[PDB]
Amino acid sequence: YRPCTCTRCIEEQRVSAWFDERFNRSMQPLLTAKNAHLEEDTYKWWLRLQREKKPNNLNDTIRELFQVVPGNVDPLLEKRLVSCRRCAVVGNSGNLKESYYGPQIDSHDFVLRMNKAPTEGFEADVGSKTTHHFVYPESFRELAQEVSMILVPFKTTDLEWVISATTTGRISHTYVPVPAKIKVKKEKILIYHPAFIKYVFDRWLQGHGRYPSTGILSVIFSLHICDEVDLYGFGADSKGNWHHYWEKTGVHDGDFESNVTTILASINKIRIFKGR
Ligand SMILES: [Cl-]
């Protein structure tokens, strides 16, 4: 832990007891060979998200995964080498349209994006820069060469997919078709820690919903990796519409998720850019 040199620091204690109760400095948001053993209850919970009939042994899968992708990444992505890390987290809302936020977005040290969201042809609004990009097998698009891919695994097969799609191309389906092959270089792949998913669900969502959305997973990841966090493209537009910029059930609690980001903004732990 080090205090940052930004105007404010996310880690700063005693600003908000609500914040101090939830934020856990000892959490590691990325999987490594050294941190990969899940406690029993964590592992059971994670298996219940999508309930694969009979998953391959997790230890086996992870051993194989780290023969492919790097197994000794710094879990905070070398935050300790800088004194202020400024991050933009850019969601998929149509509220980005005609917002003109691109240049401010690209002014950040890291820019974090998710799902199939394009920047090409939208740069004036969403920026041209990406440092990190959150995907899963059923929500992937090819990424520029300089972009770190963060796989968010919601079942054991998602880990097997990363191995397959960078090697043999044998996995072409989960419950829907998925890319058999991807072009991302192995050394640019990061794996969101399943225990970090549960931390977000338990501490930050307080168990609202079946499991956390990519949106809220990206935000809480950024609170740990960054010193300063600006959100873009979260929520509805000014007309109340939920449409993506480029084009309910109980599984996620979008209302509660949006309430978390709202509270975070109210305590200056993030700034929210609402767009149009
Ligand atoms: Cl551990």
Side-chain angles (χ1 to χ4, degrees):
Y1 160 78
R2 86 293 176 274
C4 83
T5 60
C6 322
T7 298
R8 291 184 183 86
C9 301
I10 285 158
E11 288 172 344
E12 188 180 335
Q13 292 175 339
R14 295 187 214 269
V15 174
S16 168
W18 174 97
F19 179 85
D20 295 349
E21 159 177 348
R22 286 159 176 75
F23 192 81
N24 180 349
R25 282 162 185 198
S26 75
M27 285 313 304
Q28 305 178 38
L30 295 159
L31 196 69
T32 68
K34 291 189 330 210
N35 77 14
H37 174 89
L38 302 187
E39 318 150 44
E40 189 181 71
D41 66 331
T42 294
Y43 178 53
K44 288 176 159 39
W45 174 85
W46 183 75
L47 288 182
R48 208 206 62 116
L49 304 184
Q50 300 193 336
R51 283 148 28 251
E52 296 206 283
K53 188 164 31 147
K54 210 319 111 190
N56 294 333
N57 179 277
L58 180 65
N59 204 21
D60 283 353
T61 299
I62 288 164
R63 188 195 158 270
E64 210 181 348
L65 176 64
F66 292 142
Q67 294 182 310
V68 175
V69 310
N72 197 217
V73 314
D74 182 47
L76 303 178
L77 299 170
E78 307 284 20
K79 195 187 182 170
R80 67 165 184 275
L81 298 183
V82 294
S83 68
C84 176
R85 178 181 280 165
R86 301 187 166 92
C87 294
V89 173
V90 180
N92 296 339
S93 181
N95 72 27
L96 281 164
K97 296 161 105 169
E98 318 275 65
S99 61
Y100 300 100
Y101 289 145
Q104 282 306 313
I105 291 166
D106 285 347
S107 73
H108 291 77
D109 304 316
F110 280 8
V111 176
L112 293 90
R113 307 186 188 268
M114 57 205 78
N115 302 112
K116 299 184 177 177
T119 70
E120 179 165 54
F122 305 88
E123 294 92 341
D125 289 336
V126 312
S128 52
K129 177 146 98 174
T130 317
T131 56
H132 304 79
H133 190 130
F134 293 95
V135 302
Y136 47 100
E138 303 84 352
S139 190
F140 170 82
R141 71 153 164 89
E142 300 290 2
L143 300 176
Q145 275 186 103
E146 306 306 312
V147 180
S148 292
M149 174 183 130
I150 300 166
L151 175 84
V152 186
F154 301 99
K155 56 186 174 303
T156 305
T157 290
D158 295 349
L159 306 173
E160 294 175 51
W161 174 78
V162 169
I163 299 170
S164 164
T166 62
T167 59
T168 57
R170 57 161 202 102
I171 293 171
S172 62
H173 290 91
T174 55
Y175 47 88
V176 292
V178 301
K181 294 287 266 153
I182 68 178
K183 304 166 75 60
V184 181
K185 303 179 296 137
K186 294 156 193 187
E187 68 264 15
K188 295 298 293 188
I189 297 177
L190 297 172
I191 313 290
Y192 202 108
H193 205 307
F196 203 89
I197 300 178
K198 189 173 188 295
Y199 151 71
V200 173
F201 185 69
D202 290 342
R203 302 320 259 87
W204 293 93
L205 302 183
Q206 296 180 260
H208 284 90
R210 194 197 186 82
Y211 54 97
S213 69
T214 312
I216 196 61
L217 291 171
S218 81
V219 169
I220 306 311
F221 181 97
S222 299
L223 299 186
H224 288 263
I225 282 294
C226 312
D227 298 304
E228 188 171 278
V229 171
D230 294 321
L231 253 53
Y232 301 88
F234 274 69
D237 65 22
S238 63
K239 302 180 180 64
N241 306 324
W242 299 87
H243 276 110
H244 290 148
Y245 63 80
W246 69 92
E247 68 190 350
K248 186 178 72 268
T249 51
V251 178
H252 316 300
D253 194 333
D255 286 351
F256 194 85
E257 290 182 18
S258 163
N259 197 228
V260 178
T261 63
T262 293
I263 295 164
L264 285 160
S266 68
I267 59 172
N268 307 116
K269 288 298 184 181
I270 69 179
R271 294 188 59 167
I272 297 175
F273 296 84
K274 285 177 168 6
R276 309 296 300 277

Coordinates of all heavy atoms in Angstrom, one line a residue, residues 28 34-38 193, ligand 1:
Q28 N -6.8 -9.5 -4.3 CA -6.0 -9.5 -5.5 C -7.0 -9.8 -6.6 O -7.7 -10.8 -6.6 CB -4.9 -10.6 -5.4 CG -4.0 -10.5 -4.2 CD -3.0 -11.6 -4.1 OE1 -2.5 -12.0 -5.1 NE2 -2.7 -12.1 -2.9
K34 N 0.4 -18.4 -7.8 CA 0.5 -18.3 -6.3 C -0.8 -18.1 -5.6 O -1.0 -18.5 -4.5 CB 1.5 -17.2 -5.9 CG 2.9 -17.5 -6.3 CD 3.8 -16.4 -5.6 CE 3.1 -15.1 -5.4 NZ 3.9 -13.8 -5.4
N35 N -1.8 -17.4 -6.3 CA -3.0 -17.0 -5.6 C -4.2 -17.9 -6.0 O -5.4 -17.5 -5.7 CB -3.3 -15.5 -5.6 CG -3.8 -15.0 -7.0 OD1 -4.2 -15.8 -7.8 ND2 -3.8 -13.7 -7.1
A36 N -4.0 -18.9 -6.8 CA -5.1 -19.6 -7.5 C -5.9 -20.6 -6.7 O -7.0 -21.1 -7.2 CB -4.7 -20.2 -8.8
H37 N -5.5 -21.0 -5.5 CA -6.3 -21.9 -4.7 C -7.5 -21.2 -4.1 O -7.4 -20.2 -3.4 CB -5.5 -22.5 -3.6 CG -6.2 -23.4 -2.6 ND1 -6.4 -24.8 -2.9 CD2 -6.8 -23.1 -1.4 CE1 -7.0 -25.3 -1.8 NE2 -7.3 -24.3 -1.0
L38 N -8.7 -21.7 -4.4 CA -10.0 -21.1 -3.9 C -10.4 -21.9 -2.7 O -10.3 -23.1 -2.6 CB -11.1 -21.3 -5.0 CG -10.9 -20.6 -6.3 CD1 -12.1 -20.7 -7.1 CD2 -10.4 -19.2 -6.3
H193 N -9.9 -12.7 -11.1 CA -9.8 -13.7 -10.1 C -11.3 -14.0 -9.7 O -12.0 -13.2 -9.3 CB -9.1 -13.2 -8.9 CG -8.5 -14.3 -8.0 ND1 -9.2 -15.3 -7.5 CD2 -7.2 -14.5 -7.6 CE1 -8.4 -16.1 -6.8 NE2 -7.2 -15.6 -6.9
Ligands
CL1 CL -3.9 -17.5 -1.6

